[PDB]
Amino acid sequence: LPALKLALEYIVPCMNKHGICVVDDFLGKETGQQIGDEVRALHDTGKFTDGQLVSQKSDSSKDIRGDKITWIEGKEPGCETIGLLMSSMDDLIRHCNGKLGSYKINGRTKAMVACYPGNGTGYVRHVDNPNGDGRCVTCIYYLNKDWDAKVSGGILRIFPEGKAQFADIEPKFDRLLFFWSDRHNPHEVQPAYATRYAITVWYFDADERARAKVKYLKGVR
Ligand SMILES: O=C(O)CNC(=O)c1nc(Cl)c2ccccc2c1O
Ligand SMILES: [Mn+2]
User: What does changing residue 96 to A do?
Assistant: First the structure.
């Protein structure tokens, strides 16, 4: 499906109505599996961190660590299909220009690849950008073949602002997710009991990012 059609007929109206949008079968099986192979190779070759320190025990060998990350630019050897994913995300956002709220996206982060190792850790409730740092859209791509949350957990639970309900999103293979990064969307990752991979990119709003430079100072003489 052409990126522009997906953007105009789905992403734009969904984001303006719900602020949370799911695209299944984004890249297709072949490409999705190649991305999975690249992420697994990063893991198997030691490129991820050891994981977020969750619980400190008196014996440090018993410390519990959770999500593991690595930052990816997309041109690294062994990462070019991740790069292709990022370019595909960028093309979608570009086709949405000037239609996602009143935001004007002019840049993004590198990709944050995350691995929940399957040891019952998740991620606490949080907002991605609560303090005006420039990030307006979160884009996540999931890689987990035959993920079944009733068995393996790892649901992303989002709590759209001022709603008596939440939205549970399974981290399914070849699924792409968009949501507003600010306080519209507090969210959490429920405990994961199998290896769970995702790739996140954040897109910046031009105005917010420009004035974030002021708030968070950059020196000339
Ligand atoms: O993986 C998901 O479905 C949702 N994950 C997150 O919301 C998430 N958010 C943040 Cl800000 C971080 C931040 C650092 C490491 C992992 C994160 C993460 O998985
Ligand atoms: Mn988050």
Answer: Little change in enzyme activity
| Three-state DSSP state, 104 | coil
CA of 116 to the centre of ligand 2 (A): 13
Specify the residue with its C-alpha closest to ligand 1, atom 19: 114
**CA nearest 167: which of 5, 21, 13, 48?**
21
Q: Does residue 128's CB lie within 6 angstroms of at least one atom of ligand 1?
A: yes
How far is the CA of 138 from the CAs of 15, 174, 205, in angstroms? 11, 16, 12
Which residues place a Cβ less than 5 A from the ion ligand 2?
Answer: 128
Domain with residue 41: its CATH number is 2.60.120.620
Query: Which domain, by its residues, includes 9?
Result: 1-221
Number of domains in the chain: 1
In angstroms, the CA 221 to CA 205 distance is: 29
Q: What share of the chain is helix, strand, coil (3-state, %, to 5)?
A: 30, 30, 40
Resolution in A: 1.7
